[PDB]
Design a protein around this ligand. Structure first.
Ligand SMILES: [Mg+2]
Ligand SMILES: [Zn+2]
Ligand SMILES: [Zn+2]
Ligand SMILES: [Zn+2]
Ligand SMILES: [Zn+2]
Ligand SMILES: [Zn+2]
Ligand SMILES: [Zn+2]
Lengths: 188, 111, 48, 84, 299, 56, 130, 138
RNA sequence: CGCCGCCAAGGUAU
RNA sequence: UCUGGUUUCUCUUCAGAUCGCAUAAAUCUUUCGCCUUUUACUAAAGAUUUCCGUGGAGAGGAACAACUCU
C-alpha cells in the first residue's frame, strides 16, 4: 500500500559517520500504530551500535514532523507531547483500529500527495516557536540511543560468547523508569 | 514398505556405510563386446573424452561403426526387423487420420 | 499510449510477476544535505 | 615537503594498484559444498516442534507452492536398475 | 559575470570548448555528456547517453563536428556534435580506457591508452586497432604531434615516451618527473607539450626536429596533488601565452608561459578541480571540478 | 490395449502444433542467484527422503 | 545559461518569521536529496578509514566553495599523517601474536583460523531486580 | 563405507585409510549432536571446519609433500574426500588460509561485497574477536 | 471388431 | 618466415525447422454421453496460452592453453 524513496532520519539516528551503506525493501514491516506496509531500510550507524532499521511509516511521520525510527521531532529533537504542550494545539488523531483511524489517515495521505514537503497542520504554527522550547534543545546528543539493547545470559551468567557478544554487557537496568500521545513516564 | 508414525529412515546414521548388494549387471564377454566393455555400465558413458562426446553438459555425440554394431546387437528382443515403410500400409498416420475422419476403422486399429 | 503502456507493463510485472524477473542493479548512491540541524551535529556533516 | 613528495606518490600508486586492476569493465562464482550441510540443517530442524526455529517454518509453507517443481525434477532423474 | 553552472549529479572530470567558441561539453562520473551555450543565458541542451562507465575524457575534433569520449567501460565513443547521435564504439582495450586524443589536420586518427599498458591507434573507418604499443605499466595520458607522426604517452613510470608511427619504435624518452604523469597537452603550434604529475611539478617539454636533447624547457609550481588520485589535466591558451592546470587544493592556477609567474589563483570551488579549459577567442576559463559545478571566469 | 495406444498416438500426432513461445526461461538459474538457494552434490536417497520430509 | 543569474542573491530580510529548519531548502520534508554516480572504491575506502581511525575528507559542492579539510576526530589524522586502511603503515606497533597449527593431521589439535586466542556482587543485584 | 568407484585404489591408500577414517568418524560426531546451546549456525561451523582440515590434509599431502600420486589425488577428489573448485581457489597467489567457499560469493552478501572474514587483521581495528556467521571464525 | 471402474458441498443448526 | 583455440559457467535477443523422429494439462466458444445443481467429467472440432526441454547468437572469465587447426 506504501512505497517510498528516502525516510526522514533525524541526525541522532544517522550515526557519527557520514558514510553509511543501506539496504532497502519494497514491502517490509508493519507500523506499530496503524499496521501500514511501509519500506523498511537497514543500515549500520557505528561500529559498536545496532542497526535501528525503521519504526513507523512515512505518512505518520508527515503528520507531526516526526523522524523515522526513534519517534522524535525533526525540528528540535524532542517528543511530540512536549511540542504540542508548548504550542497548546494537539491536532487530534484517533486511538481505535477501524473506528476513525485508517479513515482519516487515508484521507490525510490523499490530500498530501501534492506537496510532500511540509506537514498538514503544523505549517502555520511552527513559525511562532523558539521561545519556550529553545531552552531545552540539545546539540551534539548522546549516542546511547544508538547502542544495542541488553542481552540475556549475562544477567544469569551463561553467556558463552563473552566479549564477542555484540549487544551490551554489565548494564543492570532499573524497573522503575522506562506511546504516540500519552502517557510517557520520563517525559513527566 | 514402512508403517505409519515412523520417520523416513533418517539417512544420516542408517545406511550411510551400507554398500548396495548388486544391480542387474549383465556379464559382457570380451572379443565380441570389446569397445563397449569399459563403459556400458557407467552413469556417464563418455563424459571426460573429447573424441566421442562434446563435453560435460553432454550435448553432441560421435561414435564409430563396430561400437554401434555392438549396440545394435545388444538392442535386440525389443527392436523390429522391419526396414522399410511398407509394413505400415493402412497403419500410417495419414491413413489413421482418414479413418478418424471417415467414421470407420481398421480391424486392429483405433475407433 | 506510452503512459498507459508503462502503466500496464508495471501492472503485468506486478499482478503476474512470477516468471523470472531480475531485481535491479543497485549501484546508485544518494546525496541528501543535512539542512535541518547541523551546526555541530556530527561535525563536518555537510552533504552526506 | 620533505617526505610528502614520495608519500603522495605512494598513496597514488597504492590507490591505482586497486582502482582498475581487478577488471572493472565473480558473477558466476558459486559452486559445490560438502553434502553433510543439508543433513545437519534438517536434523537440526526436524518436525518443527521447537520455539527456536519459528521464524523459518512459515518459509516452509512458502515452499508449498514450488513443491511439484521439485517432485517433477526428482522423478525425471530416477536411478536405472543397472545403476547403484 | 562569473556564471555558475550545475547539473552533473556526480563528479565532473572533464569539459571542453567547441573549436568555434559557441558551445561547451562536459562530462563525468554520472556518465552523461552535457552541452552548453557559451553565450545567451548559458543554457543546457542535449544530453548524450550510452556510456556504461564514467567519462574520463572529452575532446572535439578540429572541425567541431565530432566529439570523442573515453570511458571506464573500455569503450571510446564517437559522437555527432550536431545531432547528438552516436557514431561508433571503439571496442578494444581489456581494461579501463584512461584517455584519448584525435589527430587534427591529417586523415582521421584516434589514440587511446589504458590500464592494460597498451596504446592503440585507431582509424575511425576500420572498426579495428591499427597499431598496438605494449608498454608494461598503466598508461594515463596520450597526445599526437601536429604532423601526425608521433604519439606522446605519459604513464606511471615518470617518463614521457614518444612513439614513431612508421618505425613503431620507442623514439624518445623524457626524464624529469619524480612521479606519475596524469595529463599531457600540445601547444597549438606543435612546439611544446605541457605535463602534470603527482610530484606537483608542471613541466613544459619542447619537441622539435632539432632538440637541445635535454628538453626541460620550463618548470612551474603551485599545483597540488593529494590522496584523491584524480587524473589532473592542463591546457594551453588559444595563443600559447597562458598555462592552466587544475589542482586538488580548490584553486585554479594560471601561469605566464614566459616569466612563470602565477597570474591567477582562483577559488569558488568546494572540492578538487579536474579540468580547466580556455575559450578559443575570448579570455574565458571553464573550470570543472568534483563539486559538480562549473564556473566561467573572465579575464 | 493395442488399438487404444494407436488412438492416443494418433491424437498426439494430430495436435502437434509448433511451440509458438516467444521467450524462454529456466527458473533454476533465477533461484541460484538468490543468496537463499545453494548448490551442492548429494546422494539420491538423501534428496528423496529430504523432499518427503519437507513435504510432511 | 549564465552564472550571474544563479549568483544573484534575493533582496530581503531573510524572512525570520519561519524558523531555521523550515526556511531551509528541502524537497522531501528532510533535506534536498538527489542521486549521483560517485565511484565505489574510494567511497568504501574513506568509509573504512572513518570506521577505523575516525577521519575522512568532507564531500559537498556549494557549502564554502573552498573545502579541503578533514572531519571527525581531528588530531588522529595528523597523528597518522593521513594514511588509509589499504596502505601498509610506517610501523608495526601493538601487534598481536597468535599461535598456529596447520598440519591438518592431529585430532582435536588443529586450530588454524578457528583458533581461540592464547589469553583464553552483581548477581545479588540481578537477583533482587528479577 | 560407500566407495562408488569399484576401483580397488592403488598406492598409497593404506596409509591414509585410518587417518581419513578417523576424520570421517569425527565428521559423523560433528554431524550427530543436537543444536542445544549452539545458537543457529555454530552447530554448522565444525562440519565446515572438518571438511576444511580434510581438504587441507590432502592439499599439503599432494602439493606440498609430493608423496601421494596424481591418480589417487584425482580419486580422492572424485570420491568426496577433497574438492575440485576449492583447491583451484587455494592455488591462487593471494590466499591459502581460506575458511570455506561462503566468503567468495559476492552475491551471497546482499550488499555486494565479501565478508569480514577475508580481511587482514593488521589493517583491521585492534581488539575485536569477530567470527563469520557463514563460515565460523578468522 | 469386445463401452463401462466416482470424490465432495447437499443434515444433525450459530 | 608471418598467420594462432576446443570445453565449462553467467546476459542477449531472434525463433518458424518432425523448434522435441515424443507430447502433458488448463481456459474460452460450440457439439455430445453420463447427469439433479455444481466442481471432479466423457471425447471430437475450432483458437489460444501456461509448462518440461531445445535451436543460433553479442560479451566476461576460468578450465593444459599453448597442443597446435590455419
Ligand atoms: Mg442451491
Ligand atoms: Zn503508520
Ligand atoms: Zn529518529
Ligand atoms: Zn553477552
Ligand atoms: Zn576464508
Ligand atoms: Zn569457511
Ligand atoms: Zn566470513
Amino acid at each position: 500500500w506504501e512505497d517510498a524513496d528516502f525516510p526522514i532520519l533525524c541526525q541522532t539516528c544517522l550515526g557519527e559517520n557520514p558514510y553509511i551503506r543501506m539496504t532497502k525493501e519494497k514491502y517490509g514491516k508493519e507500523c506499530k500504530i496503524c499496521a501500514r506496509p511501509f519500506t523498511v531500510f537497514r543500515w549500520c550507524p557505528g561500529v559498536r551500535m545496532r542497526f535501528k532499521k525503521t519504526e513507523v511509516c512515512q505518512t505518520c511521520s508527515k503528520l507531526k514532523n516526526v523522524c523515522q525510527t526513534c519517534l522524535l521531532d525533526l525540528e528540535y529533537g524532542l517528543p511530540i507531547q512536549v511540542r504540542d504542550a508548548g504550542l497548546s494545539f494537539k491536532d487530534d488523531m484517533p486511538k481505535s483500529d477501524v473506528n476513525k483511524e485508517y479513515y482519516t489517515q487515508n484521507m490525510e495521505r490523499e490530500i498530501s500527495n501534492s506537496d510532500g514537503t511540509r506537514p498538514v497542520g503544523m505549517l502555520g504554527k511552527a513559525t511562532s516557536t523558539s521561545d519556550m522550547l529553545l531552552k531545552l534543545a540539545r546539540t551534539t546528543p548522546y549516542y546511547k540511543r544508538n547502542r544495542p539493547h541488553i542481552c540475556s545470559f549475562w544477567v544469569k551468567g551463561e553467556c558463552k560468547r563473552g566479549e564477542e557478544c555484540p549487544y551490551r554487557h554489565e548494564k543492570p537496568t532499573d524497573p522503575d523508569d522506562p506511546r504516540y500521545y500519552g502517557i510517557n513516564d520520563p517525559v513527566a | 514398505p514402512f508403517d505409519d508414525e515412523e520417520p523416513p529412515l533418517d539417512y544420516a546414521d542408517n545406511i550411510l556405510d551400507v554398500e548396495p548388494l548388486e544391480a542387474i549387471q549383465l556379464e559382457l564377454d570380451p572379443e565380441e563386446d570389446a569397445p563397449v566393455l569399459d563403459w556400458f555400465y557407467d552413469h556417464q558413458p563418455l563424459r571426460d573424452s573429447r573424441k566421442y562426446v562434446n563435453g560435460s553438459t553432454y550435448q553432441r555425440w560421435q561414435f564409430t561403426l563396430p561400437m554401434m554394431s555392438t549396440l545394435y546387437r545388444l538392442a535386440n528382443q525389443l527392436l523390429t526387423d522391419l526396414v522399410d515403410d511398407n509394413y505400415f500400409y493402412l497403419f500410417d498416420l495419414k491413413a489413421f487420420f482418414t479413418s478418424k475422419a471417415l467414421n470407420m476403422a481398421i480391424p486392429g486399429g483405433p475407433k | 499510449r506510452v503512459a498507459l503502456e508503462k502503466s500496464v507493463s508495471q501492472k503485468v510485472a506486478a499482478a503476474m510477476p512470477v516468471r523470472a524477473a531480475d531485481k535491479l542493479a543497485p549501484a546508485q548512491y544518494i546525496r541528501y544535505t543535512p539542512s535541518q540541524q547541523g551546526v555541530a551535529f556530527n561535525s563536518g556533516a555537510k552533504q552526506r | 615537503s620533505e617526505e610528502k613528495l614520495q608519500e603522495k606518490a605512494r598513496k597514488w600508486q597504492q590507490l591505482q594498484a586497486k582502482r582498475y586492476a581487478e577488471k572493472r569493465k565473480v558473477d558466476a562464482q558459486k559452486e559445490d559444498m560438502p553434502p553433510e550441510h543439508v543433513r545437519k540443517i534438517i536434523r537440526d530442524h526436524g518436525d518443527m516442534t521447537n520455539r527456536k526455529f519459528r521464524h523459518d517454518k512459515r518459509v516452509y509453507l512458502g515452499a508449498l507452492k514450488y513443491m511439484p517443481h521439485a517432485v517433477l525434477k526428482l522423478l525425471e532423474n530416477m536411478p536405472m536398475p543397472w545403476e547403484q | 559575470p562569473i556564471m555558475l553552472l550545475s547539473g552533473h549529479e556526480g563528479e565532473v572530470y572533464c569539459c571542453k570548448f567547441h573549436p568555434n567558441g559557441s558551445t561547451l561539453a562536459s562530462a563525468g562520473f554520472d556518465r552523461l555528456i552535457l552541452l552548453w551555450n557559451v553565450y545567451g543565458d548559458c543554457d543546457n541542451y542535449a544530453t548524450l547517453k550510452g556510456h556504461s562507465g564514467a567519462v574520463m575524457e572529452l575532446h572535439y575534433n578540429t572541425d567541431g563536428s565530432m566529439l570523442f569520449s573515453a570511458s571506464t567501460d573500455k569503450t571510446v565513443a564517437v559522437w555527432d556534435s550536431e545531432t547528438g547521435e552516436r557514431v561508433k564504439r571503439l571496442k578494444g582495450h581489456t581494461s579501463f580506457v584512461n584517455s584519448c586524443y584525435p589527430a587534427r589536420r591529417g586523415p582521421q586518427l584516434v589514440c587511446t591508452g589504458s590500464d592494460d599498458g597498451t596504446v592503440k591507434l585507431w582509424d575511425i573507418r576500420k572498426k579495428a586497432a591499427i597499431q598496438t604499443f605494449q608498454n608494461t605499466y598503466q598508461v594515463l595520458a596520450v597526445t599526437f604531434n601536429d604532423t601526425s607522426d608521433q604519439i606522446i604517452s605519459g604513464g606511471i613510470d615518470n617518463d614521457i615516451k614518444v612513439w614513431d608511427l612508421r618505425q613503431n619504435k620507442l623514439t624518445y624518452t623524457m626524464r624529469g618527473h619524480a612521479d606519475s604523469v596524469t595529463g599531457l597537452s600540445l601547444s597549438s603550434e606543435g612546439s611544446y607539450l605541457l605535463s602534470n604529475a603527482m610530484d606537483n611539478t608542471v613541466r613544459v617539454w619542447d619537441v622539435r626536429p632539432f632538440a637541445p636533447k635535454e628538453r626541460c624547457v620550463k618548470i612551474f609550481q603551485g599545483n597540488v596533488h593529494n590522496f584523491e588520485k584524480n587524473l589532473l589535466r592542463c591546457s594551453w591558451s588559444p595563443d600559447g601565452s597562458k598555462i592552466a592546470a587544475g589542482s586538488a587544493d580548490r584553486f585554479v592556477y594560471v601561469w605566464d608561459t614566459t616569466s612563470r609567474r602565477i597570474l591567477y589563483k582562483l577559488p569558488g570551488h568546494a572540492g578538487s578541480i579536474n579540468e580547466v579549459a580556455f575559450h578559443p577567442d575570448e579570455p574565458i576559463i571553464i573550470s570543472a571540478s568534483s563539486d559538480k559545478r562549473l564556473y566561467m571566469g573572465e579575464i | 490395449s493395442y488399438q487404444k495406444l494407436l488412438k492416443y498416438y494418433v491424437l498426439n500426432a494430430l495436435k502437434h502444433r509448433p511451440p509458438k513461445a516467444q521467450k524462454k526461461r529456466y527458473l533454476f538459474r533465477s533461484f541460484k542467484a538468490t543468496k537463499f538457494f545453494q548448490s551442492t552434490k548429494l546422494d539420491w536417497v538423501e534428496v528423496g527422503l529430504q523432499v518427503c520430509r519437507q513435504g510432511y | 545559461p549564465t552564472y550571474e543569474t544563479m549568483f544573484a542573491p534575493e533582496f530581503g530580510p531573510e524572512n525570520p518569521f519561519r524558523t531555521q529548519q523550515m526556511a531551509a531548502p528541502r524537497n522531501m520534508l528532510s533535506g534536498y536529496a538527489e542521486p549521483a554516480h560517485i565511484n565505489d572504491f574510494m567511497f568504501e575506502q574513506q568509509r573504512r578509514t572513518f570506521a577505523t581511525y575516525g577521519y575522512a575528507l568532507d564531500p559537498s559542492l556549494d557549502n564554502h566553495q573552498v573545502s579541503a579539510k578533514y572531519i571527525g576526530s581531528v588530531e588522529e589524522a595528523e597523528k597518522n599523517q593521513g594514511l588509509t586502511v589499504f596502505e601498509t603503515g610506517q610501523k608495526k606497533t601493538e601487534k598481536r601474536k597468535k599461535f598456529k597449527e596447520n598440519d591438518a593431521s592431529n585430532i582435536d589439535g588443529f586450530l588454524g583460523p578457528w583458533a581461540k586466542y592464547v589469553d583464553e556482587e552483581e548477581q545479588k543485584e540481578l537477583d533482587e531486580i528479577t | 563405507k560407500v566407495k562408488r568407484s569399484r576401483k580397488a585404489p592403488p598406492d598409497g591408500w593404506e596409509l591414509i585409510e585410518p587417518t581419513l577414517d578417523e576424520l570421517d568418524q569425527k565428521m559423523r560426531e560433528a554431524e550427530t549432536e543436537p543444536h542445544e546451546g549452539k545458537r543457529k549456525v555454530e552447530s554448522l561451523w565444525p562440519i565446515f571446519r572438518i571438511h576444511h582440515q580434510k581438504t587441507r590434509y590432502i592439499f599439503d599431502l599432494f602439493y606440498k609433500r609430493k608423496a601421494i600420486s596424481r591418480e589417487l589425488y584425482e580419486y580422492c577428489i572424485k570420491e568426496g574426500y577433497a574438492d575440485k573448485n576449492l583447491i583451484a581457489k587455494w592455488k591462487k597467489q593471494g590466499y591459502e588460509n581460506l575458511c570455506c567457499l561462503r566468503c567468495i560469493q559476492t552475491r551471497d552478501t546482499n550488499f555486494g561485497t565479501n565478508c569480514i572474514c577475508r580481511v587482514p587483521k593488521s589493517k583491521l581495528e585492534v581488539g575485536r574477536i569477530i567470527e563469520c556467521t557463514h563460515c565460523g571464525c578468522r
